[PDB]
């Protein structure tokens, strides 16, 4: 620490003000809030005849009169005031840029298109090409990074991800300490192996512009938020972590009582399905910052699993008291109606939350689940689609499609959907088993076993493996491996000893088949031993087992 924390304070103070100055609410909010957790330098390139327009442009933007601001800056040669006009021009298009199919779900009303941004993208390329100083060398300044960042985000709109990363990484080399820029970079990954490749780019190819930045900040590893970058990537998708634990500790020492870290730190427990610890880790942050509303829906979600409706309701009452139209506020409420089995109404509130941002966290997916309980099976499936195109990294979105198509007579489309989600979260025990179950319809029994055997290993608890053991024998029965049927079917019999003789219906079929198989093998005495093992179940299995027992004794 020592001067390292002090050097952060001065430069972080910058990232709070100019970001707020040129109307970036999201980035400035994170940075300024970081001042509080952390334990008036002014300057801009402007002329008096041009400084006036910035005041004109900024206040019109504040009054939310977006479209007038574009006209009033029609001809501006300023390096970065042009950014403000295009930023206003971009958003003016966006609000009316609603796809028709998604809009039907977005509202339920049930009732020039994109060329503007093409002009916008051409304008930004034209301006930079004709601009005096390019990004190369120690030239350029803070405003230039905004242009590239605005160029980068618009590139993502036409799904030009490959070029999008180049623009974003270019923008951040010029200026760091912009949180909003890295948020959009996250959506550029949609894959796991590229992350380490991108990590390799940062460690070797990437370099910072020390001219704008302060001391001990051009270096990548002395930078504090490159840790934040590493935190976000390894929580969206685990993969293989590199220095994840060690770097997390250092950033915890700095930034005391930082709510965002604690929320992220607690969120890790939810990704680890450690619910009991998660509530405690959520509970303190509520006490510290009662009026913080970001990522409270996660707190709702865990409470949904615990079904502490009494606790959840007061949470819903408390949240709605202080604000009633923020996306999390509607999201938590819609979650509440699900606890009351009122699935038909939870759609309405999720619908309200959706219109607020239309690119939220996994709220599209939760909307789809409620449709499933309504047996629509068609709103939900296309609903699950909207989560995919926005965020292709969502496990639940892909899973919902495969799960829903499983109910559909065709299972063929479901295999692909499960395959993608399998890559996203191979650690889940359910997905491998479900994939194998659907893959059995394919008739390629050999590949299902490789999936089936991995499901068992990843299933941890052995008691739940009893049901999947019987599935192994059934598939092996389709092949000339009846011996392999027995060796795995005797395993689930062994698990019954481990499961204190639960003697469920699954092992009832297992026990009778072994007796029949051993009778066919001539082992009457052995088959007679399992004959009395079926002491419970339906009547038909009891009479068949006694028939086997009677037959075995006659042969002795």
């Amino acid at each position: 620490q020592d001067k390292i924390i002090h050097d952060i304070r001065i430069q972080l103070r910058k990232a709070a003000t100019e970001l707020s100055r040129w109307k970036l609410y999201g980035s400035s909010k994170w940075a300024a809030e970081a001042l509080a957790g952390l334990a008036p330098q002014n300057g801009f390139g402007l002329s008096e005849t041009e400084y006036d327009l910035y005041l004109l442009g900024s206040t019109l933007f504040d009054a939310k009169e977006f479209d007038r601001c574009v006209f009033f800056l029609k001809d501006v040669t300023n390096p970065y005031l042009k950014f403000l006009k295009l930023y206003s021009k971009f958003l003016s298009w966006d609000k009316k840029s609603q796809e028709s199919m998604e809009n039907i779900l977005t509202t339920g009303k049930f009732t020039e298109s994109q060329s503007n941004i093409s002009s916008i993208l051409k304008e930004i390329n034209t301006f930079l090409e004709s601009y005096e100083i390019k990004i190369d060398d120690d030239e350029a300044d803070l405003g230039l990074a905004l242009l590239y960042y605005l160029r980068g985000v618009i590139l993502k709109q036409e799904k030009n991800i490959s070029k999008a990363m180049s623009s974003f990484l270019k923008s951040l080399s010029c200026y760091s300490f912009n949180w909003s820029c890295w948020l959009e970079l996250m959506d550029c990954l949609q894959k796991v192996d590229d992350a380490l490749l991108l990590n390799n780019y940062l460690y070797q190819n990437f370099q910072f512009k020390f001219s704008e930045n302060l001391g001990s900040q051009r270096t990548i590893e002395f930078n504090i938020m490159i840790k934040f970058f590493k935190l976000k990537v390894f929580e969206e998708l685990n993969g293989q972590l590199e220095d994840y634990f060690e770097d997390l500790e250092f950033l915890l020492q700095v930034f005391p009582n930082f709510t965002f870290l604690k929320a992220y730190n607690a969120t890790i427990s939810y990704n680890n399905l450690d619910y009991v610890t998660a509530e405690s880790r959520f509970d303190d942050i509520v006490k510290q910052d009662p009026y913080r509303l970001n990522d409270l829906e996660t707190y709702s979600n865990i409470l949904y699993v615990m079904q502490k409706n009494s606790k959840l309701a007061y949470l819903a009452q408390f949240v709605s008291q202080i604000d009633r139209f923020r996306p999390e506020t509607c999201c938590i409420i819609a979650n509440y109606y699900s606890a009351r089995q009122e699935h038909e109404k939870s759609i309405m509130y999720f619908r309200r939350a959706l219109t607020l941002d239309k690119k939220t966290t996994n709220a599209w997916t939760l909307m789809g689940h409620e449709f499933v309980e309504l047996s629509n099976s068609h709103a939900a499936i296309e609903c699950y689609r909207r989560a995919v195109d926005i965020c292709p990294r969502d496990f639940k979105a892909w899973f919902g499609l495969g799960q829903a198509y499983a109910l559909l007579d065709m299972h063929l489309y479901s295999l692909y959907y499960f395959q993608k989600a399998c890559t996203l979260k191979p650690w889940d025990r359910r997905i491998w088993q479900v994939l194998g179950e659907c893959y059995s319809k394919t008739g390629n029994k050999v590949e299902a076993i490789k999936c089936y055997k991995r499901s068992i290993k990843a299933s941890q608890t052995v008691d739940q493996n009893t049901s999947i053991y019987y599935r192994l024998a059934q598939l092996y029965e389709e092949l000339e491996d009846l011996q392999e049927c027995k060796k795995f079917m005797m395993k689930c019999v062994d698990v019954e000893e481990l499961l204190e003789g639960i003697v469920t219906d699954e092992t009832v079929k297992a026990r009778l088949w072994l007796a029949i198989f051993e009778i066919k093998a001539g082992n009457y005495q052995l088959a007679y031993d399992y004959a009395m093992g079926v002491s419970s179940g339906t009547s038909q299995e009891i009479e068949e087992a006694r028939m086997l027992a009677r037959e075995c004794r006659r042969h002795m």
């Binding site: 298109s113 051409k122 036409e158 063929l412 692909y416 395959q419 390629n444 590949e447």
Partner: protein, 123 residues
């Protein structure tokens, strides 16, 4: 002229004249149904000529120029199914069907890609 000489199944003079046309109009007509039309036609001719590589490149550049187009996605999926890149083509077929409702030929192509995905057992 290129479209005609493609119709007559010559596949050579069509390509030459189309390349001449685009090399005339490299500087101008960046958009507005001129560059996209000529480039997609050249790519389709290359596909007919079985030269699929620059076909992939030109179809990709057309797609990045304009995304909302069912034909571009369907043809790129056809190109990928010509090779073995099913993982990168079925998404394109998905998008093409999403953009335009029927796409009967695209439906058949995607269905076949489905039986391929069943048939293949890649890790």
């Amino acid at each position: 002229m290129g479209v005609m000489y493609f119709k007559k199944n010559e596949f050579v003079k069509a390509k030459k004249y189309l390349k001449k046309a685009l090399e005339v109009v490299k500087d101008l007509d960046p958009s507005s149904r001129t560059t996209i039309s000529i480039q997609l036609n050249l790519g389709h001719t290359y596909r007919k000529l079985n030269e699929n590589e620059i076909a992939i490149k030109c179809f990709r550049c057309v797609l990045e120029k304009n995304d909302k187009n069912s034909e571009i996605h369907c043809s790129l999926g056809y190109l990928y199914l010509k090779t073995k890149k099913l993982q990168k083509a079925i998404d394109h077929l998905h998008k093409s069907l999403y953009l335009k409702p029927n796409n009967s030929s695209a439906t058949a192509l995607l269905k076949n890609a489905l039986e391929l995905n069943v048939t293949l057992s890649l890790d």
